[PDB]
C-alpha cells in the first residue's frame, strides 16, 4: 500500500541518477563553502598578526630595559663606587624591578588551547567583521564535506 | 523506527508544501533567528554577570598583593638606611624575603585547595554552559544559512 506508494514516488522523483549528480554537486559544494569561508580566515589572520606585532615589540622593550639596568649596576659596582656601598642599592633595585614587573603583569590584565586563545583575542579586541562562532561552524561543515568527498572518491 | 519515519514524512510534507520556497523560507529564517537570539539573551546576561563578579574579586586581590609588597619594601628600606646599617640587617632581609616567598606560596596553595575541595564537594552533592553553547551553535548556523540564502 503506502510502501508501493513511496516506491512509485521513488521512481517518480528519486530518478536514481542522483549518484553522479551527487558527486558533482558535492565537488562543487566544497568549492562554494571554501569561497564562503575565505574572508573570515583573512580577518582572523589580520587580527592575529596585529596582536602579535605588539607582543614582539613589548618583549623587545623589556629586554632592552633589563640590559640598561644591568649596565648601570655594573658600571657603578666597579667604577664609580665600591661593592660595599652598592650591596643594599643592588638588592633594593632588584626588589623594585620585581615590583615593577608585577605591576605590569597586573595592569595588562591541544587544539582547544588555540580555540581558547582565539576566543580570548576576539573577546578582548571585539572588532566587527569576524565572528569566531560562525567561523568555527563553517570550518567544521567544510571539514565534514572534505571527508565525505574522500569517502566518495575512494 | 515508526516515529522516525513519521517525523520524516512530516518534514518532507512541510518542505514540499511551502510556496515561494526562496522567499517565504527566508522570512521564516528571520523569525527563527530572532526567536533564538531572544531565547539566548538570559544565558548571556547571566554569564556576563557571573564573569564580572568573579573578575573584580581577582582584581582587588592582586591590588592588595601589590600594596603589601610595597609596604614590606618600605619597612626594609627604612630599617636598612636610617635606623641600622646594612651590615647588621643583611640576614634579616634575607630571611624576610624567604618568609614572604613562603607566604605567597602558602596563599596559592590555600586558594587552590579550598577552591578544588569546594568544587568536588559541590559536584558530589549535586547557568548551564552546555545549552548556552549549543544555542550559540544553532543561532550561528541559522544566521549563516540566512546569509547564504540572501546573497
Amino acid at each position: 500500500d503506502v510502501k508501493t506508494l513511496v516506491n512509485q514516488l521513488y521512481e517518480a522523483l528519486n530518478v536514481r541518477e542522483h549518484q553522479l549528480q551527487k558527486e558533482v554537486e558535492l565537488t562543487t559544494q566544497l568549492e562554494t563553502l571554501q569561497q564562503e569561508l575565505l574572508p573570515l580566515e583573512e580577518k582572523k589572520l589580520e587580527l592575529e598578526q596585529v596582536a602579535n606585532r605588539r607582543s614582539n615589540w613589548m618583549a623587545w622593550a623589556g629586554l632592552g630595559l633589563m640590559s640598561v639596568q644591568f649596565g648601570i649596576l655594573a658600571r657603578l659596582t666597579w667604577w664609580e663606587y665600591s661593592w660595599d656601598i652598592m650591596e643594599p642599592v643592588t638588592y633594593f633595585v632588584t626588589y623594585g624591578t620585581a615590583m615593577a614587573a608585577y605591576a605590569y603583569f597586573v595592569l595588562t590584565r591541544n587544539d582547544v588551547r588555540d580555540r581558547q586563545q582565539l576566543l580570548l583575542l576576539h573577546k578582548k579586541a571585539k572588532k566587527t567583521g569576524f565572528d569566531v562562532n560562525q567561523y568555527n561552524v563553517l570550518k567544521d561543515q567544510i571539514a565534514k564535506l572534505e571527508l565525505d568527498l574522500k569517502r566518495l572518491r575512494d | 523506527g515508526l516515529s522516525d519515519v513519521k517525523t520524516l514524512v512530516n518534514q518532507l510534507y512541510e518542505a514540499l508544501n511551502v510556496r515561494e520556497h526562496q522567499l517565504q523560507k527566508e522570512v521564516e529564517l528571520t523569525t527563527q533567528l530572532e526567536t533564538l537570539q531572544q531565547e539566548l539573551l538570559p544565558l548571556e546576561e547571566k554569564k556576563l554577570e557571573l564573569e564580572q563578579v568573579a573578575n573584580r574579586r581577582s582584581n582587588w586581590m592582586a591590588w592588595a598583593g601589590l600594596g603589601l609588597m610595597s609596604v614590606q619594601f618600605g619597612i626594609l628600606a627604612r630599617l636598612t638606611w636610617w635606623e641600622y646599617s646594612w651590615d647588621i640587617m643583611e640576614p634579616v632581609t634575607y630571611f624576610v624575603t624567604y618568609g614572604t616567598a613562603m607566604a605567597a606560596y602558602a596563599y596559592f596553595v590555600l586558594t587552590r585547595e579550598e577552591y578544588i575541595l569546594n568544587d568536588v564537594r559541590d559536584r558530589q552533592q549535586l547557568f548551564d554552559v552546555n545549552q548556552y553553547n549549543v544555542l550559540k551553535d544553532q543561532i550561528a548556523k541559522l544566521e549563516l544559512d540566512l546569509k547564504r540564502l540572501r546573497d
Binding site: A103, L107 | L68, S70, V71, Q72, G74, R78, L79, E83
Partner: peptide
C-alpha cells in the same frame, strides 16, 4: 598610572612609619 602611584606610595610611607614605631616600641 595615577591609581598605581596612589596604591604604591601610601603603602611605602605606611611601612616607613610602621618601622619607625616598631623600632621605638622594641
Amino acid at each position: 598610572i595615577i591609581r598605581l602611584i596612589l596604591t604604591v606610595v601610601p603603602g611605602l610611607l605606611i611601612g616607613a612609619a610602621i618601622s619607625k614605631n616598631i623600632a621605638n616600641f622594641l
